[PDB]
Symmetry: D2
Subunit: 141 residues, 4 copies
């Protein structure tokens, strides 16, 4: 069915000047962009956004990085969007992405496991939570 | 348990200059205001916000009225907030509110069944939907 | 002439539950509220907002306090609004406000010189800068 | 000196899937994107945004088109940004752009004089007005 998912272009991809190319890729893949904005997570908001990983070992590093500079979020809409966007971005480790998914966003724009260019919702439940965390219904147009 | 609910102060109460009194009431009743903003529904957004009533006879009237001028929305947080806020606002018919709930917001500021001063979420499900429709997680502070 | 000015209800007045009373006061004084939102200054944004005082001795204290919790900003519109609103809020020192302007907002809700309940733009130039700092034309309705 | 200017990607370029390419162009030209969002002008807001042309013959057509679908605005920052961005987008008539500025955005993505892909601020005064109309200081990051 037609679905919505969230992506966030991370500070590393921002600094590399990759924003336009990343959005263009999703446009070429046939998604509609339903919301879009540049903003900056405070450490506290980044922590809330990533609440599921609060226990994980990488948490503090992720929260600091994701609040270290402005990011760009977009809502992507399309058939089977959540699964397809996951596949388009590729594995979390950018170097592994180059090895197993060489056309993926992370392979093209990611550096390593932490600076990996982009976030995408990983499930219908997380997509629902993540979209609302960043955009209200008023911002979806 | 501690809950969050949405209120919206409607154009009639706005024009009457009731906004400050209405917010004060909720403050005195012990609620935390977690988000607040003045905005204006387009007819389309008011329709989406009220999607559950799209089949009802009053729908078009409601949509037009709720997009006829600016409104103010707030997220209210407190113990049992969803049911308590409903009870504070009183029955939908302002005139009836004056008859059976004379201290209710609608009794005090409502005119009739349409110009009834204020909206509040009516269930945990609708609260969840309505808060996200108006406010992102970034606007809840 | 009809003017716009900015007010910000500060964390002290927020915690005191003064928000509704403060907005009511401005409503009773005959102002239109043209924009309204609850948000939180990062220390950096509070610094930029108060750039004129960057050299003053109180600057760091002010920046920290104004980013220590959520605040509410409003655009107030009315005849001679900038000077009238200044007068309604009263002298910066809440204690002195109680001595020389006993009906002023700061007399009623302010504590001292730092926790003084409320900010208002102090000139046409600062009003223009401050309103744009907090609200876009899209948020004025 | 370092300046800020506003661009808006119009509904025609949006529908053509040109958004990513357009932002990429500005990134390659060496600008920093300081603010970015997708939103929709109401006819009234489009009219206010374009107040200077309220007397012109094309006004109603422009207002309707610019409110006919979602658009994307960005704040671009860089040395001499206002003048350089004007030149990059090219003349207003897309067909003339193709004739006299074949590398310009309007030549590449514009259709004619009305569907001409993109808006940019045309002077320091209009840039100041336009940026504030769309983005607050809080949104510039």
């Amino acid at each position: 069915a037609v679905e919505r998912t969230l992506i966030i272009v991370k500070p590393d991809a921002m600094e590399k000047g990759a924003l336009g190319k990343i959005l263009d890729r999703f446009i070429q893949e046939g998604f509609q962009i339903k919301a879009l904005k540049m903003f900056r997570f405070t450490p506290e908001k980044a922590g809330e956004f990533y609440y599921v990983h609060r226990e994980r070992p990488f948490f503090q590093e992720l929260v600091e990085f994701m609040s270290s500079g402005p990011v760009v979020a977009a809502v992507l809409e399309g058939e089977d969007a959540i699964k397809r966007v996951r596949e388009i971005i590729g594995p979390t480790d950018s170097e592994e992405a180059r090895k197993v998914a060489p056309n993926s966003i992370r392979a093209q724009f990611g550096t390593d496991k932490g600076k990996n260019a982009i976030h995408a919702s990983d499930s219908p439940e997380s997509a629902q939570y993540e979209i609302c965390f960043i955009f209200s219904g008023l911002e979806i147009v």
